[PDB]
Design a protein around this ligand. Structure first.
Ligand SMILES: NS(=O)(=O)c1cc(Cl)sc1C(=O)O
Length: 358
């Protein structure tokens, strides 16, 4: 890379890895639209396997950006509308509290207090129906945001129903394949296992556990090269050849709700650029990010603003990811690590890198 990028990235990430005891990390910087890659440490400590540009990391909640874009693509196809009642796609959801809860509410965590986690006990499809039928909202729809896998996870599952495709098949054919993300997986194939890093949680090697709506909410694994391509795609949607995917990307960066200085998209979250760094850094801490907050509707939603800091943090038990980009500046970063280390440290590092390059 140019020495400036090298210097900026190494000066920032070296101390981060040391301070957070991260076993392995991959970073991509997208600069003037071109990617530059950096790798450190171990994908598998026991087998002494280094992180490379081919290493697969669990993205955790960064998966929600793919779910958001896939939903966007289904909207662009005319298959679903965000204004549709949830019950249009799940007629068995007959309980009265669902009246007035739309696909938009599910997608944006504003249905009225759906919980962060789908309960462990929920396995089967019937367990899932029973859970949603019995769930009681704390709030009216479209009044409070509570970040929730059970919310966007259900959005993802319903969004693909008119296609008739499984969620995984729709994601592969409609998003991964057209974008040439050929090393991005909801389920890691046996051929690619040699590249799948272990995550580390309290010193133990772990991978994501199966759970209901896992694919839709936290289940994607990818390499640093494919994630750099994902950023490039989201930086410049209008360069994508497939028309509905182009639009779906745009729709995912539209601003539907505001809380504080953040705006909620489909999967992506956005702030006006230039941002206050304390506001994105402190705001990324789960103490704020996972809290119940009143939202103001953006009526109608503001189409993707290029002068934005667009980002998403993601974690699984053993991994911590972060992606951020600024469309106006052709600038972005992906940070993939095999330890779930605190969000503010990720954002602080990303800001220091992008601020220096901007
Ligand atoms: N499957 S789960 O326990 O609900 C779960 C949920 C998120 Cl988000 S990560 C994770 C894992 O297993 O690492």
């Amino acid at each position: 890379a140019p020495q400036q990028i090298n210097d900026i990235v190494h000066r920032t990430i070296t101390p981060l890895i040391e301070q957070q005891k991260i076993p392995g990390m991959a970073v991509a910087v997208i600069y003037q639209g071109k990617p530059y890659y950096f790798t450190w440490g171990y994908a598998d400590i026991a087998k002494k396997q280094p992180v490379t540009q081919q290493t697969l990391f669990e993205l955790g909640s960064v998966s929600k950006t793919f779910t958001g874009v896939l939903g966007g693509d289904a909207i662009a196809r005319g298959e679903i509308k965000l204004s549709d009642p949830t019950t249009k796609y799940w007629p068995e959801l007959t309980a009265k509290q669902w009246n007035g809860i739309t696909l938009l509410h599910l997608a944006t965590y504003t249905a009225g207090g759906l919980p962060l986690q789908v309960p462990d006990e929920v396995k089967s499809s019937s367990d899932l129906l029973r859970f949603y039928q019995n769930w009681q909202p704390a709030w009216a729809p479209g009044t409070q945001r509570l970040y929730a896998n059970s919310s966007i996870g259900l959005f993802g599952a319903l969004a693909v129903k008119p296609s008739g495709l499984s969620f995984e098949q729709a994601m592969q054919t409609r998003v991964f394949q057209p974008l040439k993300l050929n090393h991005t997986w909801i389920n890691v194939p046996p051929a690619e296992e040699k590249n799948y890093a272990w995550g580390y949680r309290e010193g133990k090697a772990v991978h994501v556990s199966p759970g209901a709506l896992d694919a839709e909410a936290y289940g994607v694994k990818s390499t640093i090269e494919d994630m750099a391509r994902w950023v490039q795609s989201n930086l410049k949607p209008l360069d994508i050849n497939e028309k509905t995917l182009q639009q779906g990307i745009q729709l995912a960066q539209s601003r539907y709700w505001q809380t504080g200085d953040m705006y909620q998209g489909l999967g992506w979250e956005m702030l006006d650029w230039p941002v206050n760094p304390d506001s994105i850094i402190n705001g990324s801490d789960n103490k704020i990010a996972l809290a119940a907050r009143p939202v103001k509707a953006i009526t109608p939603p503001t189409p993707a603003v290029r002068a934005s800091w667009v980002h998403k943090t993601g974690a699984t038990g053993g991994f911590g990811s972060y992606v951020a980009f600024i469309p106006e500046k052709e600038l972005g970063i992906v940070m993939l690590a095999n330890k779930n280390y605190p969000n503010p440290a990720r954002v602080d590092a990303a800001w220091q890198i992008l601020n220096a390059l901007q």
